[PDB]
Structure formats: structure tokens, C-alpha cells
Design an enzyme around this catalytic site. Sequence first.
Site, PDB file in Angstrom:
ATOM      1  N   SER A  19       0.598  -1.170   0.156  1.00  0.00           N
ATOM      2  CA  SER A  19       0.186  -0.068  -0.135  1.00  0.00           C
ATOM      3  C   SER A  19       1.334   0.877   0.294  1.00  0.00           C
ATOM      4  O   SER A  19       1.467   1.324  -1.004  1.00  0.00           O
ATOM      5  CB  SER A  19      -0.615   0.021   1.150  1.00  0.00           C
ATOM      6  OG  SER A  19      -2.454   0.445   0.802  1.00  0.00           O
TER       7      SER A  19
ATOM      8  N   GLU B 259       0.393  -4.165  -3.721  1.00  0.00           N
ATOM      9  CA  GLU B 259      -1.364  -3.095  -4.028  1.00  0.00           C
ATOM     10  C   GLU B 259      -0.676  -1.916  -3.669  1.00  0.00           C
ATOM     11  O   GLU B 259      -0.432  -1.475  -2.569  1.00  0.00           O
ATOM     12  CB  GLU B 259      -1.604  -4.163  -3.253  1.00  0.00           C
ATOM     13  CG  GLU B 259      -2.163  -5.626  -3.601  1.00  0.00           C
ATOM     14  CD  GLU B 259      -3.900  -5.438  -2.711  1.00  0.00           C
ATOM     15  OE1 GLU B 259      -4.194  -5.198  -2.199  1.00  0.00           O
ATOM     16  OE2 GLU B 259      -3.880  -6.832  -3.384  1.00  0.00           O
TER      17      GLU B 259
ATOM     18  N   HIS C 249      -4.886  -7.668   1.624  1.00  0.00           N
ATOM     19  CA  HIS C 249      -4.134  -6.067   1.465  1.00  0.00           C
ATOM     20  C   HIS C 249      -3.365  -6.466   2.627  1.00  0.00           C
ATOM     21  O   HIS C 249      -1.934  -5.526   2.810  1.00  0.00           O
ATOM     22  CB  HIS C 249      -5.227  -4.968   1.330  1.00  0.00           C
ATOM     23  CG  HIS C 249      -4.498  -3.828   1.377  1.00  0.00           C
ATOM     24  ND1 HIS C 249      -4.015  -3.868  -0.065  1.00  0.00           N
ATOM     25  CD2 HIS C 249      -4.346  -2.880   1.955  1.00  0.00           C
ATOM     26  CE1 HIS C 249      -3.605  -2.152  -0.134  1.00  0.00           C
ATOM     27  NE2 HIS C 249      -3.839  -1.697   1.342  1.00  0.00           N
TER      28      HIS C 249
HETATM   29  C1  LIG Z   1      -3.717   1.923   4.923  1.00  0.00           C
HETATM   30  C2  LIG Z   1      -3.764   0.247   4.556  1.00  0.00           C
HETATM   31  C3  LIG Z   1      -4.735   0.709   4.165  1.00  0.00           C
HETATM   32  C4  LIG Z   1      -6.721   0.540   3.237  1.00  0.00           C
HETATM   33  C5  LIG Z   1      -7.020   0.214   2.754  1.00  0.00           C
HETATM   34  C6  LIG Z   1      -8.456   0.638   2.520  1.00  0.00           C
HETATM   35  O1  LIG Z   1      -9.254   1.681   2.599  1.00  0.00           O
HETATM   36  C7  LIG Z   1      -8.996  -0.099   1.537  1.00  0.00           C
HETATM   37  C8  LIG Z   1      -8.202   0.467  -0.632  1.00  0.00           C
HETATM   38  C9  LIG Z   1      -6.972   0.632  -0.496  1.00  0.00           C
HETATM   39  C10 LIG Z   1      -6.471   1.214  -0.916  1.00  0.00           C
HETATM   40  C11 LIG Z   1      -5.446   1.353   0.377  1.00  0.00           C
HETATM   41  C12 LIG Z   1      -4.499   3.142   0.439  1.00  0.00           C
HETATM   42  C13 LIG Z   1      -5.021   3.913  -0.323  1.00  0.00           C
HETATM   43  C14 LIG Z   1      -4.060   4.960  -0.051  1.00  0.00           C
HETATM   44  O2  LIG Z   1      -5.051   6.003  -1.026  1.00  0.00           O
HETATM   45  C15 LIG Z   1      -3.248   5.850   0.112  1.00  0.00           C
HETATM   46  C16 LIG Z   1      -2.995   4.590   0.958  1.00  0.00           C
HETATM   47  O3  LIG Z   1      -1.389   4.685   2.345  1.00  0.00           O
HETATM   48  C17 LIG Z   1      -3.441   3.066   1.638  1.00  0.00           C
HETATM   49  C18 LIG Z   1      -2.802   2.370   3.057  1.00  0.00           C
HETATM   50  O4  LIG Z   1      -1.890   2.742   3.174  1.00  0.00           O
HETATM   51  O5  LIG Z   1      -3.850   0.760   2.488  1.00  0.00           O
END
Ligand SMILES: C[C@H]1CCCC(=O)CCC/C=C/c2cc(O)cc(O)c2C(=O)O1
Lengths: 269, 269
Positions: free
Chosen positions: A102, A126, A242
Site C-alpha cells: 500500500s 498492492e 491487502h
Molecule cells: C492503510 C492501508 C489500508 C487501507 C485499506 C483501504 O482503504 C482499501 C483500499 C486500498 C487502498 C489503500 C490505501 C489507499 C491510499 O489511497 C493510500 C494508502 O496509503 C493506502 C494504504 O496504505 O492501505
Amino acid sequence: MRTRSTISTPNGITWYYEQEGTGPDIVLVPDGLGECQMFDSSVSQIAAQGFRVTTFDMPGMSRSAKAPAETYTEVTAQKLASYVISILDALDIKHATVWGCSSGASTVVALLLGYPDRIRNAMCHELPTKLLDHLSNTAVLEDEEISNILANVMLNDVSGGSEAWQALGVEVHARLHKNYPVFARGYPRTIPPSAPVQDVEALRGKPLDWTVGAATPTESFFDNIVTATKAGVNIGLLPGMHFPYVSHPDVFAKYVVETTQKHLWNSSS
Amino acid sequence: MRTRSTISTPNGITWYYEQEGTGPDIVLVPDGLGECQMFDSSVSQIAAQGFRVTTFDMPGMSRSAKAPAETYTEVTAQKLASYVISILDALDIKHATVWGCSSGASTVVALLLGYPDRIRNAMCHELPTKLLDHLSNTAVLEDEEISNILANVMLNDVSGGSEAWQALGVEVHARLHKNYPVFARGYPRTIPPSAPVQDVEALRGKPLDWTVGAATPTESFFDNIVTATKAGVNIGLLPGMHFPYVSHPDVFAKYVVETTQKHLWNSSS
Ligand SMILES: C[C@H]1CCCC(=O)CCC/C=C/c2cc(O)cc(O)c2C(=O)O1
Ligand SMILES: C[C@H]1CCCC(=O)CCC/C=C/c2cc(O)cc(O)c2C(=O)O1
Ligand SMILES: [K+]
Ligand SMILES: [K+]
């Protein structure tokens, strides 16, 4: 055998970190929730194969909360990569294999591109490259509503393993409760546009191994598969969604060990 | 305004077919279950944009069941393509846009590569290239056990919309119930190895538009995204999973119309 300690970097951050093992350095960068207890089982399994494994809570999150506001607001891949290099400098880790999911995936690709002397190889999972307005819109809610919304999203939608997610335990979920609003306000609006995958030709030939969750809906990281394929980068799947290090810790540990071993062989060639 | 009729081809098949509209020909090839009532809503919506739309039940399936055993045993993409060309010859369709999902996807790529003079452009969705032992092994069960198991799989695992799937209604589900054993004993062992996407350079520059379902688990058609990208073939998503024409008929119809219109423009240019 696990060291659990803190270290202060001259950007103002006091990090909580853990280390285990001796041998080549492997560094596990958290996802945007910034909580390194998610790696607990995997750290021991990786270190047992002859590696020194380091992980840490991310700035402003969990036990790394003693940090200036600029480290956890308007967060970009480039900011996070500068912060990870500061803790590697402080721990005298000169050469490292790096993992991140992420915002951690965006971080490790920025580290490999930006600091090539320092990074043996990077594993990215991801990597977010698109804004999600429904996530960005949580940032204007009250703290308790953000925590309720995102705790439910992690448990029921993207954990890849609800029983393993719950089994992180009360103390971890109490830290994540406090991180949800910090993450919501600092990450979703600024991490995706900072994704270091603008220039496919900059990725070509680099020691990068990219994964997506096998059970993740195709639409979520479809763009990662396309980008990796265009760049000729190794692209494959891990079980779950994730959080493979939570849902499938032994498969995750085996992947990190085998990928690190592959790059140790190639580097000596 | 819809023709609903039967036509016999010199290979021994008596086809059930439907046709609506006037204009350039679009042909909608069913998935392995061979049931063209799944297109009913979309046929009218596509035909209303100025096209002659044709569809049919597949040999051995539903109302096309009067056919020699060779047409529904040891089935390959190249056998299916030869059968589709036979019905297009019988209906005097000289130049067609074609759609297919699953074994229908393998069929339309085999049509485009094998009969380039006849095919304006092909849309392929979720093309199976890997053997699935759990599916292949259903063939040794009793007919009613295969129908019970595969009805449950279709609804719960791949429909992409349980309400729309059940709303196909008793007449359709009763025809599918009889098709499941024919599909199980004819398709799963021979379709995936026949996939006409092993020669990546043969696809390059071809009038092919590839889709996968947005909600489909990434592992299911990961290989389609990789292959399309390597070939430079247009690859994108439709809502739902394996049956976008059932789950999202208006989005499906719009995609078919827009893609056909893009190729009519490019043909003239
Ligand atoms: C925190 C973790 C769970 C976040 C899990 C979630 O919200 C589902 C969508 C996947 C995206 C995660 C995410 C999206 C962003 O725009 C910025 C990010 O830093 C993330 C991310 O770090 O994912
Ligand atoms: C309609 C659905 C039936 C079976 C649908 C199913 O169980 C999983 C769908 C993914 C693969 C389907 C499929 C697989 C094959 O090996 C051969 C095929 O002809 C298909 C196929 O036609 O898909
Ligand atoms: K495991
Ligand atoms: K629709």
C-alpha cells in the site's frame, strides 16, 4: 531474541522499532496503518533463515507517534522514503532488501529508484495509484466515525482473513483505533498522486518483485498488473488481500526469504 | 421485432437462434452453458442503436441440443469457431462483430485469427487458459449431482449478481440444469489447452478488445491481463464477474455498441 526499542532521527521522529536475527538486512515497511506488530510471526520465521530483520511503526502511528506534524500530514511516497532512509542511517543499515504494502509499496519503489546504492531489491504489494473519493471523504468526519468506518473496512472487506485480523488482539486494535484518523487525514488524498510509477522505463531492469492479493477484486490493483507487465517487472500473487503478512504469515515469510535469496544469488553472479 | 427460429447446418446441428435489428452484424456467442436467453435484454438495446444482432444456443445445449455427439464432446475453441462460421454461413452473415465470454471468448479469438475476412472485431471476456481439476473431476459424478453442484457454483461464485441470476427464471434455470452435465463432460479438460492466446505475436495489432470482471478475484483471470498487455491488446473491466450480460445488461449493451462503433470508425479510416 527480538530487540524492541526506540531511536531518534534528526527529522524529529522518535521511532519504535524491532530487530531480530543476523545476516543480510531485510526491512519490513508497514502499510498506511503504520503498525509493525502485524509482522510479528513473520519476523521470527524470516530471521531464522539467516537474515537480520528490522521493522518499525511509521511516523505519527502507534508507538512512533512522537513525530512532527509534517511526517503524518500531506504524506507522499517521497516523504516516507526519506523517513525510512533516516532510520536505516540511524541503525547503520547500509544495504537492505525492503518489503512494503500500500503506501509501504509506494515507499519501497521510491526507495529503490531514489536510493539505488542502499536497496538490494524491493518487494511491493498492492501499490495505490488512483484516488478513491469515498476514502478521501472520510478525512472531514469526526475521529470516532473515521475509526468505526475504517475498522469495519479492514475487518470485513480487505483483511483477506477476518479470524487472523481479529487475532492481532486487543492492544493492536486499540493502537489502530487511534491511527485511523491520522491515516485518513494524511494519506489517501496525497499518496496515490505521488506513486513512483509515472515512468515505466525507469522501472525496467530494476530488482523489483510486485504482488497483488489473489482474492482482491480485479478492479482494485488491475493497474499494478498492467504497469508491471509493461515494465517487464516480475508480477505475481500472494494468498489473501491487502495484508498477506496477517492472513498468511508463513506463505508471506517464505516469499520474502525466497525472493531475497534469488537476489543474493543474482548479485553474486 | 425479434426473430426466434431454428436453422440446420450441414454438420448435423439444428440451431435455435434469435435475431433483431438492421445494420452491421453483431453476433453474441454464449459462454460454455450455451444459453442465449442470457442476452435477451441486451439484444434489444444493441439492435436499437442501428445493428442486426444475432445469437443462438450452442450445440448440445438448451434449444440447440439436436446435434451430433462430436459437437459437445472434446470441445475446443477451434471446433466451436467452425460451428459458429457454419451458422453465420446459413444466415448469410458475411462480416460480423463478435462477443464471447469463457469458452465463447476462446471461440471469438479463434474466429478472428482463423477467419479474418469474416470478423470485423472481437470482444473476449474472461478467457480460460488453465485447467481446473475440481471442475474437470465433476465429469465422473451422476448427472443430478453435477447439476446441483454447478447450479450452486454459478449462483454463488461467478454470477456477479445473485438477484439478476435468479431472475433469469424457472424456464432458463431448467434448461441450464440439463446443460450442466453436457458442459462438465465436454468442456473443462479440452477448452483451456485450446486457448488461442499462446502465440502472443499473432494477437498484436488485431481488432481485439479484452475484458475481465471488476469483482472477479484477481487470481481467476490474472493471466488474461498479462497476456493482453504483452500483446498490446486493449484490456479493461466490466462490472460484475463472469456474466456481465446478466448482472449489468445496460452497461454490457453500451460496451458492445461503443466498441463496435470504434471499429466501424477505424475500418473507414
Ligand atoms: C492503510 C492501508 C489500508 C487501507 C485499506 C483501504 O482503504 C482499501 C483500499 C486500498 C487502498 C489503500 C490505501 C489507499 C491510499 O489511497 C493510500 C494508502 O496509503 C493506502 C494504504 O496504505 O492501505
Ligand atoms: C460458463 C462457465 C462454466 C463454468 C464456470 C466456472 O465454474 C468457473 C468459470 C471460469 C471458467 C469457466 C470455464 C472453464 C473451462 O475450463 C471451460 C469453460 O468452457 C468455461 C466456461 O465456459 O465458463
Ligand atoms: K500461512
Ligand atoms: K446495467
